[PDB]
Design a protein around this ligand. Structure first.
Ligand code: 0GJ
Ligand code: 0GJ
Ligand code: 0GJ
Ligand code: 0GJ
Lengths: 242, 244, 243, 243
């Protein structure tokens, strides 16, 4: 998370950390608890190539990474069939836990938006995670969960910005319909924030608008962060998630 | 280059090294001399974002990198308009040299294939370059130009191989029509070989079949190297480069 | 630490962590609280060249590095005047804290040994710290304080071991009288463990025998860890630190 | 080499490169050909611990590293018996080539100084090598041999400079009689230049004054480069190398 501040213990109960086995259970991606047995993340975290489920654990909401680890095994990874690279869409994945979680007030699920919600610019949105604090700068110990308010951008404005200082034809779409844009040069998500949720408060409810997907660097000029648009994939999500 | 051997001084006169300015004029990509003023390379080398032409030089065929440098400036970089990421196609770009080259027997152009040439499996093809010798293993000094004979694979076989041990739906194409497949677990191109030519001897002539583009690792099982299919982009190439 | 295990919360109350300012207050050395306003460390941590006292803080006994930081400023660094390189001796330093600490049961001082204590082989000794877990392998998060029981070796035996597979003349001392040897191929201290205490239980008391100083690699054959012998420097220590 | 320029093909015929086996025969140290079968280098290159002679080769004077390699095996490594660390003296070693070299005009030996030569300040001295071009900055391809003219400094001036911004007692000798000082903030030797010769033109002859040994960083203020004084070790050299 580029910009923002440390998140209070009360906020973001649906935030999850994905761990990979090595010299320790290392954080590599974020995710959101969308159902007591289902985690929504980004496909580029776990795909396109198949990984060993044994080398993967899930950690639910914790203020400081690695301090009070209670790691949960995963029974299934479901990656969108249309996925190969993050920039070309379908950057969405589901992880099914071995067992469902006993949801408390400190740890509970996020609401997915209704199919009609567009999330227009000027929407109050937050992105949370334990990713890089800047370009090639890791989040320093004790690894607090960070939060940043990000400005939503109209897809066509963002697509135009991505064409500035690029050789790509103006008629060729860089930012697509299954994507969402947010952030500026002070506020953005970074590496290790992928899969993490972009949440907006709509009608007094916290809905998950997007999943951290990609961008050209972190908080670079004319390169806002691109998120997978959750509304676009609700049918696919609901084919597995109740 | 994974596998193969050091190339003799006589072979591959069209091979070029692209250099980027830093503490030295560092090799980052390969390319091929297709016309005395034009270099054919991969778009992911120079794009999608526009770079300063001043920080880019071209080095023609040399046996050992950096030892006898005669660096040439570039007046134009033309990246295919449909390009953004290597895996999603249009990974092709042209570089116009500020001055034409005096083509000798040791340094001369490669012939582009006729639009109809398909390059079927069992074709004798070579890939050349100064890229990594293995995964995360740089080519050691004195940096000799390497060559490897690579087996051509049918696109459908190759698209099927890329689906093995992948979550991508079988009905979703990974290897597109503007792409070509070559190599195995012993023979492949690697990082720093991009833009480099895949040449095949057809009817006693050396034709450039492809441009080193992408792959999952280097010489990994069921992951052959993916090249940009030159035939697919001839019309775009010939919009800038003279036919004759 | 190479070998051993995570230390229980009750053990080693005198263990300290030295912090250097950067993107965060990073651990670079250990030390021991020998008096409520004095920390005993290794000179190679802070010298031979003078550093800014402002970029240095001290953290007292904590189970996991960085999680519950209460960083203390330092008013003075006193490096032994003979010191230049770790291998050539005098690898000892004192840090004076701006204010003394309120010593609890969880955080209190270590006893320095009497001048006569030799620490013979077969002594039960421990080395503690947050250093590397192996050669070029950092201690992984949540950075627990590690402990290892190390076998003491006689100086003449150890100097002989250091001459095996070395060009140095047999008559030339590598392991000097101001040094102590401990550890094997399974048990040793490593990089980031320097300054850290080597403690032995003698007559029901915990005495600091040494300070982590140097060695050839971590847990290598015929290369035990070399510690600064605290008894050798008691007069210098007591010139600044109250007994 | 920090500062200076690429050396012409005619200059420094005695310069050698020491190679270690790995993914390629990599340059790690410099040296000088003092006799057709003998290379003079620094002991910290090859010691204090004994290495496998099989994994070590010698390359004679070449303009660009790795281009036209003609690697020579080594039969014997003789490290000064008093050596353990570079800063504490005796940083000198000899390599005996498996067979003597056919000395040409482009590749020949350097003249060792007479025992009486002191090399006073204001002497025109050069240091050559393929070491780092700055702190943590490797020499870029095609790896040309570099050369830099370095100002000689009196040992007492040097020792005093090494005490500025250091905790070491003023009466504690850091720079000793078996050492020589040269260089400033623009001109110095660096990592990978060790073993490399410091040559001075005296009475129309090129004499090897020193061997690149140590320093605090490269071209840092009040930290000139320390070289092993060849005159100090002539008796030891001549015990193995013919006059
Ligand atoms: C997988 C995940 O950790 C990252 C982070 C998303 C980046 N977000 C913003 N706002 N920049 N996603 C990726 O790594 C996907 N690929 C890319 O973002 C690349 N186009 C840039 C790679 C780079 O600069 O490191
Ligand atoms: C840009 C160029 O040097 C490389 C060479 C392709 C590797 N060749 C074969 N045969 N596998 N092109 C790329 O690296 C394009 N991106 C990818 O290949 C990615 N799938 C992996 C990128 C990476 O290694 O980080
Ligand atoms: C300064 C302190 O953290 C280290 C650790 C002592 C190592 N303990 C054992 N048993 N090996 N002390 C030093 O780094 C002093 N210099 C050396 O130990 C060198 N001889 C080796 C350097 C290295 O391995 O990196
Ligand atoms: C072994 C050899 O390549 C170097 C060269 C000495 C640096 N020369 C000048 N003129 N500054 N010798 C060493 O690395 C020996 N140890 C040291 O120099 C240490 N005092 C500093 C630690 C380090 O930078 O390695």
């Amino acid at each position: 998370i580029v910009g923002g501040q440390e998140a209070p213990r009360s906020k973001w109960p649906w935030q999850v950390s994905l761990r990979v086995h090595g010299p320790y259970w290392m954080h590599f991606c974020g995710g959101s608890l969308i159902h007591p047995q289902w985690v929504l993340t980004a496909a580029h975290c776990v795909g396109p190539d198949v990984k060993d489920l044994a080398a993967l654990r899930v950690q639910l909401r914790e203020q400081h990474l690695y301090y009070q680890d209670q790691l949960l095994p995963v029974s299934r990874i479901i990656v969108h069939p249309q996925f190969y690279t993050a920039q070309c869409g379908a950057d969405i994945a589901l992880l099914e836990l071995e067992e469902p979680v006993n949801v408390s007030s400190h740890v509970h699920t996020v609401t997915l938006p209704p199919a009609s919600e567009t999330f227009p610019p000027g929407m109050p949105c937050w992105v949370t995670g334990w990713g890089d604090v800047d370009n090639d700068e890791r989040l320093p110990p004790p690894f607090p969960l960070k939060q940043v308010k990000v400005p939503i951008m109209e897809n066509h404005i963002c697509d135009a910005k991505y064409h500035l200082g690029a050789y790509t034809g103006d008629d060729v779409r860089i930012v697509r319909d299954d994507m969402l844009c947010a952030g500026n040069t002070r506020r953005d998500s970074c590496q290790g924030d992928s899969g993490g949720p972009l949440v907006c408060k709509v009608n007094g409810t916290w809905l998950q608008a997007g999943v951290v997907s990609w961008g050209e660097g972190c908080a670079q000029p004319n390169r806002p962060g691109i998120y997978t648009r959750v509304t676009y994939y609700l049918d696919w999500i609901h084919h597995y998630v109740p």
